[model samples]
Target: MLKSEKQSRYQMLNEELSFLLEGETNVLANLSNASALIKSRFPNTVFAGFYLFDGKELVLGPFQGGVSCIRIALGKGVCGEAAHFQETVIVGDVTTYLNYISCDSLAKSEIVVPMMKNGQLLGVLDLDSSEIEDYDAMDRDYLEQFVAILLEKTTWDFTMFEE
Candidate 1:
């Protein structure tokens, strides 16, 4: 996708997500639907999902992808690193990034957006693309907003992690 088209794509996605999440309060259900929506709409993506924070580490949550790493510590791969830093991490070329963990050889690029609430770590939104340099500032912006919308629409009870 061209950079020029990114904004519109995300705008549509944001609208769709807002509608899908309307009246929905279950975090798991929302995460599942959100990942499915992203995977189905985004182009060339190998993965789309979340890693819920488990106090000490990140545990795989609802995701649209093949086999993936089940656990990642803080400051680890792109996802963990983003969570550790509490910021978004965009790796245009995953192969070029040091300490990048490869859960799938087909993933050439990745973007991880940390989910935080009230200064507390919640989780991360992870996206992987087969094309190198697939994500950019546009993706970062929209995804950050996506997480923001999710945060606003749903309650973070943390009990969702118990199961």
Candidate 2:
């Protein structure tokens, strides 16, 4: 993504994210709205969702985009791996990694960022793109802030019940 294009997308994303987290505050609802906003902006995106730490495993919350494999055990795929370590993980080439999950065979690259609230695991943002290296530093940098704002707007009072 070019600087201008990235900036445009970033700004749009920021605005959309802001709208998603507007009034009517609730952690679950905020995440669901955010997922819908992101998926709508990038209609072709896939496997976009939120994951949270519930004492035991990272549980899937609200999301948009394509089908996702529920119940991602820690250290499993890119999504789980990010939650396991509490950091952002980007695979420019998922094909090179054996631990990758093929939610979409055409997904050439992917990115996952953890959402932390008051230093505790709240959830994660998972994004997949069909283009190789579709995600870059811009995605990582902006994604960090994306979850940061989400964390700030919502209260973390949910249980770790798996779905």
Candidate 3:
């Protein structure tokens, strides 16, 4: 898809995500629907989901995709790096990224955006694409916005998931 088209699509998705979260704040329900929405938007999407921080590691939360890694240590894969650095990590070619973990062999590219609230690391919004270079600055921009909206609109208390 073209950058212009992606921008437009993400804009619409942002609005829809916000609309869907109004007056409700169940973590499981919100993330489940969000993952489903993202999975439906892109045909090449290999995975779309969230990994909540349990203070020690990133534990897989709600997601839409095939089998995935259950836990990723901080500074490990694309998702872990994003969480470790508290920033977005965009891998145009997962094959070339050192220490890249192949949760799905079909995934060629990925973008991970850290989900932070009140300056505290919460989790990450991880998306994978089947084609190399499928993600770029536009993806980073929109996905960052998506995470922002999620954090702002939803009331997340990670302590509930502590184990």
Estimate the Cα RMSD of every predicted model relative to the unseen true structure. 1.7, 2.9, 2.0
lDDT of 1: 0.90
N/CA/C clash count, model 2: 1
User: Which segments of candidate 3 are over 4 A away from where they belong?
Assistant: 158-163
The superposed Cα distance between candidate 3 and the true structure at residue 102, in angstroms, equals 1.1
Instruction: Order the candidate numbers by lDDT, best to worst.
Output: 1, 3, 2
User: What are the per-residue Cα lDDT tens digits for candidate 3 across 1-163?
Assistant: 9888988888888889999988768787888999998888888999999999988999999999998999999998888889988999989888888978787659999999999888888889999999999999988888889888887778785466679
lDDT of 3: 0.88
| lDDT tens readout by residue for model 1, 9-128 | 899999999999999878878888999999978878899999998899999999999999999999999988999989999998888899788886499999999999989899999999
Clashing pairs in 2: 54-160
| Model 3 residue 89 lDDT score | 91
List of clashing residue pairs for candidate 1:
none
Screening candidate 3 with a backbone cut-off below 3 angstroms (N, C-alpha, C), the clashing residue pairs are none
The prediction achieving the highest lDDT against the true structure is 1
lDDT of 2 by residue, 73-162 (tens): 788899888887889999988999878877654788899998876667766798888778788788889878888777777776455434
Off-target runs (Cα >4 Å) in candidate 2 are 158-163
Better candidate by lDDT, 1 or 2: 1
